[PDB]
Amino acid sequence: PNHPLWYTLCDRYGLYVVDEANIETHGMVPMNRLTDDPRWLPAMSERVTRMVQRDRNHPSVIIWSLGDESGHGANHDALYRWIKSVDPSRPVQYEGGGADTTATDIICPMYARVDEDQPFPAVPKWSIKKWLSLPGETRPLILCEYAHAMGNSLGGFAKYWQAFRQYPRLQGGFVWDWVDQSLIKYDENGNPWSAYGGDFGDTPNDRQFCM
């Protein structure tokens, strides 16, 4: 969840907001080791419910998201149904466990390609154009993350927008991402330079991937 002002700003300027519970368990092995453990359900519920209990009246919030990168575990299912029960005025989405789980009203892949299939086991990233027409699939497709704009990037962007306009159930996405996460440091002569991962003697680090 964001600083309270932000939603009021989206309410007044005009932007659709996906409001996101503060839950990421990426580094876990496996990624759902927590979200599937029912001893972690309490801490998770409070992270979803207390969001819902805060921003439910902001018109700009049109979609609830259960979190990010946390595999798929029962807790997600229980907390999906909780919001569905508490607030029918918004669809609930979640990319975890394959971007089309029983935990999501919207097929929301991250970095699914337009035409090329990436058949990772258990969790494949199908081409968005192919994903829609899989046997028995009816949900819409809005990527929660796409077009990784890191340095000299956004090659092939065009391809998404042409597909988006052609396929009614392809309803676009959210670019990753808005702003560089570089930070100001100063040299020996007090002149400012933009720093990234590692530059604070912080180890281990993921270098320029924060930008």
Is 146 part of any known ligand binding site?
A: yes
Query: In angstroms, what is the minimal distance from the CB of 171 to Na ion?
Result: 5
Among 96, 170, 173, 197, binds Na ion (CB under 5 A): 170
Pairing of strands 17-20, 61-65: parallel
Query: In angstroms, what is the minimal distance from the CB of 15 to Na ion?
Result: 19
Identify the H or E element spanning 181.
none
Catalytic: 69? yes
**Quick one: which segment of 13-21, 23-31, 136-144, 160-168 binds Na ion (CB under 5 A)?**
160-168
Query: In angstroms, what is the minimal distance from the CB of 134 to Na ion?
Result: 17
**Quick one: which segment of 72-80, 110-118, 140-148, 169-177 binds Na ion (CB under 5 A)?**
169-177
Q: Which of 69, 95, 116, 188 is catalytic?
A: 69
User: CB count, 10 Å around CB of 150?
Assistant: 13
- List the one residue out of 96, 51, 54 whose CA is nearest residue 75: 96
Do residues 139 and 100 make contact, with C-beta atoms less than 8 angstroms apart? yes
Our measurement of the distance from residue 49's CA atom to the centroid of its chain's CA atoms, rounded to an integer in Å, reads 18
Catalytic: 188? no
Separation of first and last alpha carbons in the chain:
21
Is 76 part of any known ligand binding site?
A: no
Question: Binding to Na ion by residue 209, rule CB under 5 A?
Answer: yes
Q: How far is CA 153 from CA 15, 111, 126, 148, 172, in A?
A: 25, 14, 22, 7, 19
- Which stretches of the chain bind Na ion, using CB under 5 A? 164, 168, 170, 209
Annotated binding site for substrate: 69, 145-148
Annotated binding site: 24, 26, 69, 145-148, 205, 209
Residues carrying an active site annotation: 69, 145
